[PDB]
Design a protein around this ligand. Structure first.
Ligand SMILES: O=c1[nH]nc2ccc(Sc3cccc(OC(F)(F)F)c3)nn12
Length: 343
């Protein structure tokens, strides 16, 4: 139901120099626009990117992209599947820059690959303005995994470019799903790979965060709990307390005391980082599931589903609301202590 458009500015490219693009399903009766950033890790040097080009080429090139994609979860237009925004204009932005959406570097004599994730987002926004985004009231920049970190890195830049282009009435907001990681100690023994990636990509981070951490330390801004307080746009954070990717980077795979304590401490640390995040949904589950899955409606925290919490967030952005909460963080300390966790 979402149709592919390759960028009209063909110099804004995927890793291999093929044009980037977006999939669009318009909803002409709606002033809501959802722009979703796909995830899929990243690559950080020539040899690592070459391997990714061999067996993850759709994440580095548009040459084999299909003409259409089906919107699912928060991108579904069916009310039953998407109680939150089923009538919105739907945009899926494929991740083909391998730079956690941070890059601003073209291919060249000296660069085998282009890392243009930050420019891809800006160009999608620019081209959408001529397709109806100029009439929007809300632009929700959403994303999962590397795309969720991408939201944190780019939401304020989207807000800034819309202001500079002359559209101050469009409210830009972020929804970061599964992109809120901790730079914690591993269970057995990362940030060095991000640190090297940033140099390889000419990666860019939000200005206020860059100014806090200063030169060489931009990697800090890839960690939600450090970049989020510097952001001005409203951002709703969705994060499993026991995210499978967090456990993977922590080298966690009949649980004895050391690992039990490690896992419990991870959940408490994650919960701590979300205490001052007023719009958040953080269930006590071991999962890698994301908000574009069709059954995203099923999980609840304190009896409230994520589509409900997002609706309550919309209302809050018109004092807390009777029966319509927006800060939903589990307090129970072990995976699947919430009975609604995905199986
Ligand atoms: O796309 C998917 N699925 N799961 C994941 C997990 C991380 C990533 S990128 C990333 C983003 C922020 C920090 C980071 O460093 C860390 F790992 F936290 F130390 C890596 N992308 N990703």
């Amino acid at each position: 139901d979402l149709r592919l458009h390759l960028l009209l500015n063909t110099s804004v490219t995927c890793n291999d120099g093929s044009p980037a693009g977006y999939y669009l399903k318009e909803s002409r009766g709606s002033r809501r626009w959802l722009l979703f950033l796909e995830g899929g890790w990243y690559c950080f040097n020539r040899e690592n990117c070459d391997s990714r080009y061999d067996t993850m080429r759709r994440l580095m090139s548009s040459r084999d992209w299909p003409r259409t994609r089906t919107g699912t979860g928060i991108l579904s237009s069916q009310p039953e599947e998407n109680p939150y925004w089923w009538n919105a204009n739907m945009v899926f932005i494929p991740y083909c820059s391998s730079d956690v959406w941070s890059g601003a570097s073209s291919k060249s004599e000296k660069n085998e690959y282009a890392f243009m994730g930050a420019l891809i987002i800006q160009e999608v926004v620019r081209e959408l303005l001529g397709r109806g985004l100029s009439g929007a009231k809300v632009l929700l920049l959403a994303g999962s995994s590397a795309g969720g970190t991408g939201v944190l890195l780019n939401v304020d830049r989207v807000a800034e470019q819309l202001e500079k282009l002359g559209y101050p009435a469009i409210q830009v907001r972020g929804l970061a799903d599964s992109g809120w990681f901790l730079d914690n100690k591993q269970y057995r023994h990362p940030t060095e790979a991000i640190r090297r990636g940033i140099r390889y990509w000419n990666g860019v981070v939000p200005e206020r965060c860059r100014r806090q951490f200063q030169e060489g330390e931009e990697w800090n801004c890839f960690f939600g709990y450090k970049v989020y307080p510097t952001l001005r746009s409203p951002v709703f954070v969705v994060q499993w307390l026991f995210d499978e990717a967090q456990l993977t980077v922590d080298n966690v795979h009949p649980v004895q005391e050391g690992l039990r304590l490690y896992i419990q401490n991870l959940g408490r640390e994650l919960r701590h980082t979300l205490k001052d995040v007023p719009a958040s949904f953080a269930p006590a589950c071991l999962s890698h599931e994301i908000i574009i899955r069709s059954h995203w409606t099923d999980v609840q925290v304190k009896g409230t589903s994520l589509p409900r919490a997002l609706h309550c967030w919309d209302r809050s952005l018109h004092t807390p609301l009777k029966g319509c909460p927006v800060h939903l963080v589990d307090s129970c300390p072990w995976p699947h202590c919430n009975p609604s966790c995905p199986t």
